[PDB]
Amino acid sequence: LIQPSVDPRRREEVTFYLIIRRKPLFYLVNVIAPCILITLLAI
Amino acid sequence: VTMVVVICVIVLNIHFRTPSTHVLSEPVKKLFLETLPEILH
């Protein structure tokens, strides 16, 4: 529950937060591993 | 495919070895020209 600042002379709200982690397996298969292989071939 | 490219690089290194660059070792020459040609074929 967020209450606003005191007025010398924004409204109060209820905020629901979602901290969410991405699961990167797709990008590990489609981008990272081909890049690693290309880097070995560049070696 | 990456491993096959590495294999091709190694095979081309083996193919273009020259007397003035590398020494043909007798164990290597006897292994890769007598034993393995008979084993494979």
mmCIF file with all atom_site columns, C-alpha atoms in Angstrom:
data_model
loop_
_atom_site.group_PDB
_atom_site.id
_atom_site.type_symbol
_atom_site.label_atom_id
_atom_site.label_alt_id
_atom_site.label_comp_id
_atom_site.label_asym_id
_atom_site.label_entity_id
_atom_site.label_seq_id
_atom_site.pdbx_PDB_ins_code
_atom_site.Cartn_x
_atom_site.Cartn_y
_atom_site.Cartn_z
_atom_site.occupancy
_atom_site.B_iso_or_equiv
_atom_site.pdbx_formal_charge
_atom_site.auth_seq_id
_atom_site.auth_comp_id
_atom_site.auth_asym_id
_atom_site.auth_atom_id
_atom_site.pdbx_PDB_model_num
ATOM 1  C CA . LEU A 1 1  ? 0.000  0.000   0.000   1.00 0.00 ? 1  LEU A CA 1
ATOM 2  C CA . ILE A 1 2  ? 1.675  3.194   -1.242  1.00 0.00 ? 2  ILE A CA 1
ATOM 3  C CA . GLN A 1 3  ? 0.515  6.400   0.462   1.00 0.00 ? 3  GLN A CA 1
ATOM 4  C CA . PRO A 1 4  ? 1.413  9.664   -1.362  1.00 0.00 ? 4  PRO A CA 1
ATOM 5  C CA . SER A 1 5  ? 3.644  12.437  -0.086  1.00 0.00 ? 5  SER A CA 1
ATOM 6  C CA . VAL A 1 6  ? 2.243  15.128  2.192   1.00 0.00 ? 6  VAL A CA 1
ATOM 7  C CA . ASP A 1 7  ? 0.737  18.082  0.307   1.00 0.00 ? 7  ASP A CA 1
ATOM 8  C CA . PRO A 1 8  ? 2.225  21.514  1.190   1.00 0.00 ? 8  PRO A CA 1
ATOM 9  C CA . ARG A 1 9  ? -1.098 23.128  0.176   1.00 0.00 ? 9  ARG A CA 1
ATOM 10 C CA . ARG A 1 10 ? -0.615 11.611  -6.620  1.00 0.00 ? 10 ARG A CA 1
ATOM 11 C CA . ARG A 1 11 ? -3.205 9.420   -4.877  1.00 0.00 ? 11 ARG A CA 1
ATOM 12 C CA . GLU A 1 12 ? -2.752 6.360   -2.650  1.00 0.00 ? 12 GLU A CA 1
ATOM 13 C CA . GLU A 1 13 ? -2.572 3.012   -4.413  1.00 0.00 ? 13 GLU A CA 1
ATOM 14 C CA . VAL A 1 14 ? -2.141 -0.732  -3.980  1.00 0.00 ? 14 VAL A CA 1
ATOM 15 C CA . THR A 1 15 ? 0.822  -2.018  -5.998  1.00 0.00 ? 15 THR A CA 1
ATOM 16 C CA . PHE A 1 16 ? 1.277  -5.685  -6.889  1.00 0.00 ? 16 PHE A CA 1
ATOM 17 C CA . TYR A 1 17 ? 4.841  -6.529  -7.911  1.00 0.00 ? 17 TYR A CA 1
ATOM 18 C CA . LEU A 1 18 ? 5.963  -9.513  -9.985  1.00 0.00 ? 18 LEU A CA 1
ATOM 19 C CA . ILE A 1 19 ? 9.685  -10.220 -9.978  1.00 0.00 ? 19 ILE A CA 1
ATOM 20 C CA . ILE A 1 20 ? 10.069 -12.705 -12.828 1.00 0.00 ? 20 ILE A CA 1
ATOM 21 C CA . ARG A 1 21 ? 13.164 -14.513 -14.102 1.00 0.00 ? 21 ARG A CA 1
ATOM 22 C CA . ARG A 1 22 ? 13.482 -15.462 -17.755 1.00 0.00 ? 22 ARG A CA 1
ATOM 23 C CA . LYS A 1 23 ? 14.295 -19.090 -18.545 1.00 0.00 ? 23 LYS A CA 1
ATOM 24 C CA . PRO A 1 24 ? 16.941 -18.779 -21.294 1.00 0.00 ? 24 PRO A CA 1
ATOM 25 C CA . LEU A 1 25 ? 17.136 -22.351 -22.648 1.00 0.00 ? 25 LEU A CA 1
ATOM 26 C CA . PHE A 1 26 ? 15.927 -21.342 -26.125 1.00 0.00 ? 26 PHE A CA 1
ATOM 27 C CA . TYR A 1 27 ? 18.668 -18.744 -26.486 1.00 0.00 ? 27 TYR A CA 1
ATOM 28 C CA . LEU A 1 28 ? 21.187 -21.275 -25.182 1.00 0.00 ? 28 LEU A CA 1
ATOM 29 C CA . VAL A 1 29 ? 20.332 -23.594 -28.096 1.00 0.00 ? 29 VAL A CA 1
ATOM 30 C CA . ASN A 1 30 ? 19.697 -21.129 -30.925 1.00 0.00 ? 30 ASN A CA 1
ATOM 31 C CA . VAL A 1 31 ? 22.356 -18.428 -30.364 1.00 0.00 ? 31 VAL A CA 1
ATOM 32 C CA . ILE A 1 32 ? 24.999 -19.259 -27.766 1.00 0.00 ? 32 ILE A CA 1
ATOM 33 C CA . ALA A 1 33 ? 26.010 -22.767 -28.858 1.00 0.00 ? 33 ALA A CA 1
ATOM 34 C CA . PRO A 1 34 ? 26.322 -21.924 -32.599 1.00 0.00 ? 34 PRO A CA 1
ATOM 35 C CA . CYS A 1 35 ? 28.380 -18.885 -31.581 1.00 0.00 ? 35 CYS A CA 1
ATOM 36 C CA . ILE A 1 36 ? 30.676 -21.113 -29.519 1.00 0.00 ? 36 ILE A CA 1
ATOM 37 C CA . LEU A 1 37 ? 31.072 -23.510 -32.443 1.00 0.00 ? 37 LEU A CA 1
ATOM 38 C CA . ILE A 1 38 ? 31.748 -20.655 -34.879 1.00 0.00 ? 38 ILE A CA 1
ATOM 39 C CA . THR A 1 39 ? 34.354 -19.323 -32.455 1.00 0.00 ? 39 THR A CA 1
ATOM 40 C CA . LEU A 1 40 ? 36.129 -22.695 -32.405 1.00 0.00 ? 40 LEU A CA 1
ATOM 41 C CA . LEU A 1 41 ? 36.102 -22.697 -36.208 1.00 0.00 ? 41 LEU A CA 1
ATOM 42 C CA . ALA A 1 42 ? 37.556 -19.179 -36.117 1.00 0.00 ? 42 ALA A CA 1
ATOM 43 C CA . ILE A 1 43 ? 40.276 -20.546 -33.838 1.00 0.00 ? 43 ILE A CA 1
ATOM 44 C CA . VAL B 2 1  ? 29.659 -30.308 -38.764 1.00 0.00 ? 1  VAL B CA 1
ATOM 45 C CA . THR B 2 2  ? 31.968 -28.277 -36.518 1.00 0.00 ? 2  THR B CA 1
ATOM 46 C CA . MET B 2 3  ? 33.898 -31.419 -35.597 1.00 0.00 ? 3  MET B CA 1
ATOM 47 C CA . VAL B 2 4  ? 34.081 -32.354 -39.285 1.00 0.00 ? 4  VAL B CA 1
ATOM 48 C CA . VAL B 2 5  ? 35.545 -28.940 -40.148 1.00 0.00 ? 5  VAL B CA 1
ATOM 49 C CA . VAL B 2 6  ? 38.143 -29.462 -37.414 1.00 0.00 ? 6  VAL B CA 1
ATOM 50 C CA . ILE B 2 7  ? 38.875 -32.916 -38.862 1.00 0.00 ? 7  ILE B CA 1
ATOM 51 C CA . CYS B 2 8  ? 39.241 -31.401 -42.340 1.00 0.00 ? 8  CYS B CA 1
ATOM 52 C CA . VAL B 2 9  ? 41.670 -28.784 -41.026 1.00 0.00 ? 9  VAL B CA 1
ATOM 53 C CA . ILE B 2 10 ? 43.753 -31.511 -39.385 1.00 0.00 ? 10 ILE B CA 1
ATOM 54 C CA . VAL B 2 11 ? 43.670 -33.689 -42.514 1.00 0.00 ? 11 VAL B CA 1
ATOM 55 C CA . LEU B 2 12 ? 44.778 -30.758 -44.676 1.00 0.00 ? 12 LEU B CA 1
ATOM 56 C CA . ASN B 2 13 ? 47.590 -30.081 -42.206 1.00 0.00 ? 13 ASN B CA 1
ATOM 57 C CA . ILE B 2 14 ? 48.621 -33.723 -42.625 1.00 0.00 ? 14 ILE B CA 1
ATOM 58 C CA . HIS B 2 15 ? 48.370 -33.538 -46.427 1.00 0.00 ? 15 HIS B CA 1
ATOM 59 C CA . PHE B 2 16 ? 50.504 -30.404 -46.945 1.00 0.00 ? 16 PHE B CA 1
ATOM 60 C CA . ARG B 2 17 ? 53.320 -31.323 -44.550 1.00 0.00 ? 17 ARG B CA 1
ATOM 61 C CA . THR B 2 18 ? 56.659 -30.860 -46.324 1.00 0.00 ? 18 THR B CA 1
ATOM 62 C CA . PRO B 2 19 ? 60.209 -32.218 -45.776 1.00 0.00 ? 19 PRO B CA 1
ATOM 63 C CA . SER B 2 20 ? 61.473 -28.688 -45.046 1.00 0.00 ? 20 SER B CA 1
ATOM 64 C CA . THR B 2 21 ? 58.724 -28.164 -42.418 1.00 0.00 ? 21 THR B CA 1
ATOM 65 C CA . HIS B 2 22 ? 58.088 -31.480 -40.624 1.00 0.00 ? 22 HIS B CA 1
ATOM 66 C CA . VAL B 2 23 ? 59.854 -34.757 -39.852 1.00 0.00 ? 23 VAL B CA 1
ATOM 67 C CA . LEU B 2 24 ? 58.096 -37.972 -40.906 1.00 0.00 ? 24 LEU B CA 1
ATOM 68 C CA . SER B 2 25 ? 58.414 -40.183 -37.834 1.00 0.00 ? 25 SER B CA 1
ATOM 69 C CA . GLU B 2 26 ? 58.929 -43.879 -38.524 1.00 0.00 ? 26 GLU B CA 1
ATOM 70 C CA . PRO B 2 27 ? 56.326 -45.039 -35.937 1.00 0.00 ? 27 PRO B CA 1
ATOM 71 C CA . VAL B 2 28 ? 53.795 -42.608 -37.428 1.00 0.00 ? 28 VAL B CA 1
ATOM 72 C CA . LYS B 2 29 ? 54.623 -43.652 -40.995 1.00 0.00 ? 29 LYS B CA 1
ATOM 73 C CA . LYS B 2 30 ? 54.403 -47.351 -40.121 1.00 0.00 ? 30 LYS B CA 1
ATOM 74 C CA . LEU B 2 31 ? 51.119 -46.890 -38.238 1.00 0.00 ? 31 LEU B CA 1
ATOM 75 C CA . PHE B 2 32 ? 49.283 -44.817 -40.855 1.00 0.00 ? 32 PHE B CA 1
ATOM 76 C CA . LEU B 2 33 ? 50.551 -46.600 -44.010 1.00 0.00 ? 33 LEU B CA 1
ATOM 77 C CA . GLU B 2 34 ? 50.720 -50.315 -43.053 1.00 0.00 ? 34 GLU B CA 1
ATOM 78 C CA . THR B 2 35 ? 48.501 -51.076 -40.045 1.00 0.00 ? 35 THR B CA 1
ATOM 79 C CA . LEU B 2 36 ? 45.479 -48.811 -40.530 1.00 0.00 ? 36 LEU B CA 1
ATOM 80 C CA . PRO B 2 37 ? 45.150 -49.211 -44.328 1.00 0.00 ? 37 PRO B CA 1
ATOM 81 C CA . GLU B 2 38 ? 44.888 -52.954 -43.657 1.00 0.00 ? 38 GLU B CA 1
ATOM 82 C CA . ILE B 2 39 ? 42.533 -52.530 -40.686 1.00 0.00 ? 39 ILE B CA 1
ATOM 83 C CA . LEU B 2 40 ? 40.168 -50.153 -42.488 1.00 0.00 ? 40 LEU B CA 1
ATOM 84 C CA . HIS B 2 41 ? 40.203 -52.011 -45.829 1.00 0.00 ? 41 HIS B CA 1
#
